[PDB]
Amino acid sequence: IWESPLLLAAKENDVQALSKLLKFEGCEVHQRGAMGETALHIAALYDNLEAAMVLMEAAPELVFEPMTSELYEGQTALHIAVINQNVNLVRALLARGASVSARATGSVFHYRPHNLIYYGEHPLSFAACVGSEEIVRLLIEHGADIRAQDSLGNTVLHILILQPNKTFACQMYNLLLSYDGGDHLKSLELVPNNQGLTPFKLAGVEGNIVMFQHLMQKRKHI
Incomplete structure (x- = not known):
């Protein structure tokens, strides 16, 4: 983050800086941090709706990218937004086609004595676990399979x-x-x-x- 202006801007919710970086094709918009996270994962984690919107608008492909580290493998911006119970961000991602079928299979998600949570793998399972009826309904309306x-x-x-x-x-x-x-x-x-x-x-x-x-x-x- 600290060495990458785009990741940092996403963390800081700095819309002006993001917009100026994104207009270049100078920042690689798909650059990743140490956990295999994109600028959009970073915006979602920090509950930065405005940065997330700028990133999704500029580079909608980011919506579909998983985290690639072993710890967070498969985690999408939608999973993060669900955990934070950011209804506006969930709606935004879903409206852009974010997959309700994406599976978070990284080690931090595993059913294990050492892990703090076990929420399954799918966005719907995350939503049910954090207790958001509104997010559960939004996900089902966008085709989430209750039988997954x-x-x-x-x-x-x-x-x-x-x-x-x-x-x-x-x-x-x-x-x-x-x-x-x-x-x-x-x-x-x-x-x-x-x-x-x-x-x-x-x-x-x-x-x-x-x-x-x-x-x-x-x-x-x-």
């Missing part, structure tokens, strides 16, 4: 079982299922992960008392 599975076979339903904040997780679980509806084959609730556990069974295995009860009474009603 991560590398462990976990759907968003499983991933919600693994989260600490059980009260919103339950509301989010139901929000997500309201888009599943009366489909002519298996409820998403019946899809197992690679361990062979459905969300209900996973809740039991993990000692998620809130979700185990919720889901148990659910099936009895169904």
